[PDB]
Amino acid sequence: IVDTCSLASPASVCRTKHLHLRCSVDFTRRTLTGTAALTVQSQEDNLRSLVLDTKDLTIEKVVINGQEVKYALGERQSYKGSPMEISLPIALSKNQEIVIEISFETSPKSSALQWLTPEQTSGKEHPYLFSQCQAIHCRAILPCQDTPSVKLTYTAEVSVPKELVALMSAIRDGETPDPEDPSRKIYKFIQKVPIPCYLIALVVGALESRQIGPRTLVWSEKEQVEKSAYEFSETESMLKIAEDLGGPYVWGQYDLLVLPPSFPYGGMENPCLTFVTPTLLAGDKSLSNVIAHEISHSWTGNLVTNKTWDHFWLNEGHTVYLERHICGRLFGEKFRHFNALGGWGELQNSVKTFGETHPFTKLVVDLTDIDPDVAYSSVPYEKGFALLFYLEQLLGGPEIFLGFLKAYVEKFSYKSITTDDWKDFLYSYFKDKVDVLNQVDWNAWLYSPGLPPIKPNYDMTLTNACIALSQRWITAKEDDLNSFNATDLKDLSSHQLNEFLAQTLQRAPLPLGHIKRMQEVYNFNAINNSEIRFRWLRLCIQSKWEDAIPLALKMATEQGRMKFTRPLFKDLAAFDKSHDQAVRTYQEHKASMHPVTAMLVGKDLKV
Numbered sequence: 001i002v003d004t005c006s007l008a009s010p011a012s013v014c015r016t017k018h019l020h021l022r023c024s025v026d027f028t029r030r031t032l033t034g035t036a037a038l039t040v041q042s043q044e045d046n047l048r049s050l051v052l053d054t055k056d057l058t059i060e061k062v063v064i065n066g067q068e069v070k071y072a073l074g075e076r077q078s079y080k081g082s083p084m085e086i087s088l089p090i091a092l093s094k095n096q097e098i099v100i101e102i103s104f105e106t107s108p109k110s111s112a113l114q115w116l117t118p119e120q121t122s123g124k125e126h127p128y129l130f131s132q133c134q135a136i137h138c139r140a141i142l143p144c145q146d147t148p149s150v151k152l153t154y155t156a157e158v159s160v161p162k163e164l165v166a167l168m169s170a171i172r173d174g175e176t177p178d179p180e181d182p183s184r185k186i187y188k189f190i191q192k193v194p195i196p197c198y199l200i201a202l203v204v205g206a207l208e209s210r211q212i213g214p215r216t217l218v219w220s221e222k223e224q225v226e227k228s229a230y231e232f233s234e235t236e237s238m239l240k241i242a243e244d245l246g247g248p249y250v251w252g253q254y255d256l257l258v259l260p261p262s263f264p265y266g267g268m269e270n271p272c273l274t275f276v277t278p279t280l281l282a283g284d285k286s287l288s289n290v291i292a293h294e295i296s297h298s299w300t301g302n303l304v305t306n307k308t309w310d311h312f313w314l315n316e317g318h319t320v321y322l323e324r325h326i327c328g329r330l331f332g333e334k335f336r337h338f339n340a341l342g343g344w345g346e347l348q349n350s351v352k353t354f355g356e357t358h359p360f361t362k363l364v365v366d367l368t369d370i371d372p373d374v375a376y377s378s379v380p381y382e383k384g385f386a387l388l389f390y391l392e393q394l395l396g397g398p399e400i401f402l403g404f405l406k407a408y409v410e411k412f413s414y415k416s417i418t419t420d421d422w423k424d425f426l427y428s429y430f431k432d433k434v435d436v437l438n439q440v441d442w443n444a445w446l447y448s449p450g451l452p453p454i455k456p457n458y459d460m461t462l463t464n465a466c467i468a469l470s471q472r473w474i475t476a477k478e479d480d481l482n483s484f485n486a487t488d489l490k491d492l493s494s495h496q497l498n499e500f501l502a503q504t505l506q507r508a509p510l511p512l513g514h515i516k517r518m519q520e521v522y523n524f525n526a527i528n529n530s531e532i533r534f535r536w537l538r539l540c541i542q543s544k545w546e547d548a549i550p551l552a553l554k555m556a557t558e559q560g561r562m563k564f565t566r567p568l569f570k571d572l573a574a575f576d577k578s579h580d581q582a583v584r585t586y587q588e589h590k591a592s593m594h595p596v597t598a599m600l601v602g603k604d605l606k607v
């Protein structure tokens, strides 16, 4: 097994056991500067050198046993960064540990980091910094074996301007004034559970907290605290359900941090401190499945981890499966099936977008010479989910398959694993149903592009109204438009309204007159729920409604969740009326965008 996204020595040569990070966040220079002390364990006899990943890091020196040592940085390999070879001063025997202290500074263009000016924040007085290391951005913060095949504990001391707060994916372990600079405070952290380095995270800004459960604080700027506390109030109930499904929660606290709007993902499962988009702040808790997802990664991802990124689906697909059980326990089995079926629709979309023979539609993907951020899609989520839901149905239902899931989490806790590890364990657990498992077309599900070979069975109860209303609109002629009215929506939940629009969007464009009628009778322009507004605006732009141009440009730029920003820019570029403005808008905003989002939007727009 080779990690084709990492240039570091593999785990078979040496393993990092601990990181102690001492750093200072310099907002004037947009640099993090300090020392990364790696405790490294040789796995070989006579070990005399090793290699770490880095990306846009300036290295000042490397210290082992109190003396500077030789090191060299290799040529940059695009998104992978530059390998750093370190010459050890004394050859190591197998299992010997040493500490390697590297003094480094980050680049302002670090792909792991977004540096925000005061104007870019809610409070407008103070700047803000946040990280996003998954998949392979930790190397752009500090030198490391930047591979999920290696798990380490960490401690950290972070010096920041004294008016600001630092938080990490770790337990808070104190704060004191910085003795080197009384304008600063050092915040300390400890992560005692071994983690892959993609789970290292840092935020610095003017943060406040509010308790919302026995093991949960919400953190955000002051302006968002009250709304966030309400929106995420189900979090303890979800954690309790998740513990029933997965076993004990091992991480101590489960805090939430609500980022500024350019955070690129819905959420990120950083241990102890899940990061979430403010786009979840719908006002009615309706987008709480994202919280259930991130919670679920406390087991599937954070405890049992993909050994390399080719096996991402292990992390995401199992998380989606647990996510959907939490939501089904809370809101009912009919809702689990509704969400499940919605997920298949998203998979349909992704397969159509890439093409049915595209490599990135395989469940296990080969990332040789592929930047994960470019290949990122709904495929691992939803083809993964569909496999597990198909297995659930084959093997005797949800209670049975949940016994497997708990057993799997137990078996592989604290480890990093491959698809074949998972498959082997599935066969071991279900050894009395091997004949059933042998009906599965493993090669097609795991290794073939396109839609899966079999579609699961779904309860249609909550979906039927959505499909019926979509079909009414699609089949309407001009003389049927008058028949639509606001009462059509009266028995539909926000989730159903979303699914009505996703179903309709799958047949877009519709006639411009239909779309104008839809606004006249349903007033979708008034809905601030981000998922609904996203699909509505896509529907309007694809249907060539010029009045939607400013609305779509506004949503694309006022937040930066890539789920929303990328397809809105792409749709606006594809509409001749908005094309030039879309490209100008991107060009104007690009320097102030998150670095990954900026990259991908530029690729999408061919800029």
Ligand SMILES: O=C(CCCCCCC(=O)Nc1ccccc1)NO
Binding pocket: 134, 135, 265, 266, 267, 268, 269, 293, 294, 297, 309, 310, 312, 316, 372, 373, 375, 376, 377
């Ligand atoms: O699932 C999420 C949202 C995505 C968070 C970022 C994932 C980045 C990543 O690991 N990308 C990737 C990995 C493998 C293959 C392709 C992309 N939160 O839990």
Ligand SMILES: [Yb+3]
Binding pocket: 045, 046, 093
């Ligand atoms: Yb030896």
Ligand SMILES: [Zn+2]
Binding pocket: 293, 297, 315, 316, 319
């Ligand atoms: Zn996830």
